[PDB]
Write a protein that binds this DNA or RNA. Structure first.
Lengths: 203, 193
RNA sequence: GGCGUUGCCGGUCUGGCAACGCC
RNA sequence: GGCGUUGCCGGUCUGGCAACGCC
């Protein structure tokens, strides 16, 4: 049924979430919010709740909560970035989204927006925490949506057996520059695993 | 012989085309002419000609005696200085950017000079950040052999054996894994063979 | 408090401990 | 011609090809 709304007025759950998020936002004003898995395992762990996600979206739809890909924020929370930095975060999200399977390098991005590495790192790290970007290595960050789409492609490729670097590159219409770091990242988070000199998809 | 005339021809040809290379790679001089001739005897052929003062022999390249690369006098000095910094720093070599900063060099000029030393065999590229002097790497491989003789070793134990730090040792070990000197098994290494 | 750099440690990661810079 | 950069290639660089800059 996916679950809509229930009756048990133990809204002391929402009270405990507000407390935790308020506490998190005053401590971490330059973070997007509390990790959804952290809120999961701190207040809704022992209760075998698959409805925790349905609960999150309900409060979201009420306008009580901002849901990012892996962080949750009280509605009304704004990180304490400068207005220039707030605009940059939007502009970085867009550039990485549009570039997709051919993301710009850290150095290209720093030059483009005329930022020092220190500030760029801080901004990208924010987007990584939020789940908009995923760090493949120190040079390459990928938009979440782009990465999910690359993984779908690779999963279908690997359904017929181990694949090489060239075969992944052909399936993604990409280049070795982009694909080797991607595949090394996918080994690290255990999406892929090396078999001989090729890879298969595990989980 | 013969052979020598073919060699002088080959090297004069190489030097005039590549006046900013240290010389022709030894295994190219071999596969090009003395490929039917075995590995041994070819070594003795080069060392014989080197004792006669006819060839300059480097770790991986050969040059006719008298050949000087067409670097500027400033660059020639730099190359001596670079070789020295790396030799003395040994198992804690400077990073590429550290060296670019201390010698006040554009990355492309530093690259040109390190590439020459790496071609010649004086330096070995461990990774983008770290070059090692040849002698430093040779001695470190000896330490690694000693360590491995008692059994498979961890990163911490190799750092102990080199009196070093993890920052320097891990890149060394990853390099030695890529050239198949060592092999990694879980969090241990052995020396292959 | 936070954000970052560096060093060392522990196989390794926005990891632990410490210096420093910044807010 | 070379040196470098970037791109692409072949699992990889003591590379190959192409464009650009410099000589």
């Amino acid at each position: 049924d996916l679950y809509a709304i229930s009756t048990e007025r133990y809204q002391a759950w929402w009270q405990a979430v507000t407390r935790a998020l308020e506490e998190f936002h005053s401590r971490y004003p330059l973070r997007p919010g509390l990790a959804r898995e952290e809120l999961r395992s701190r207040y809704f762990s022992r209760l075998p709740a698959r409805v925790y996600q349905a609960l999150l979206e309900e409060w979201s739809r009420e306008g009580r909560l901002q849901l990012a890909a892996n962080t949750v924020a009280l509605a009304g929370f704004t990180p304490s970035f400068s207005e220039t930095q707030k605009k940059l975060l939007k502009d970085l999200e867009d550039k990485y989204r549009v570039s997709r399977w051919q993301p710009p390098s850290f150095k290209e991005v720093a030059g483009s927006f005329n930022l020092d590495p220190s500030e760029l790192e801080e901004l990208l790290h924010y987007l990584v925490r939020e789940g908009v970007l995923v760090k493949i290595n120190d040079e390459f960050y990928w938009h979440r949506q782009a990465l999910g789409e690359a993984r779908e492609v690779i999963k279908n490729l690997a359904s017929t057996g181990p694949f090489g670097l060239a075969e992944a590159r052909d399936a993604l219409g990409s280049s070795r520059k982009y694909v080797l770091p991607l595949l090394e990242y996918l080994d690290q988070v255990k999406f892929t695993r090396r078999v001989g000199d090729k890879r298969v998809v595990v989980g």
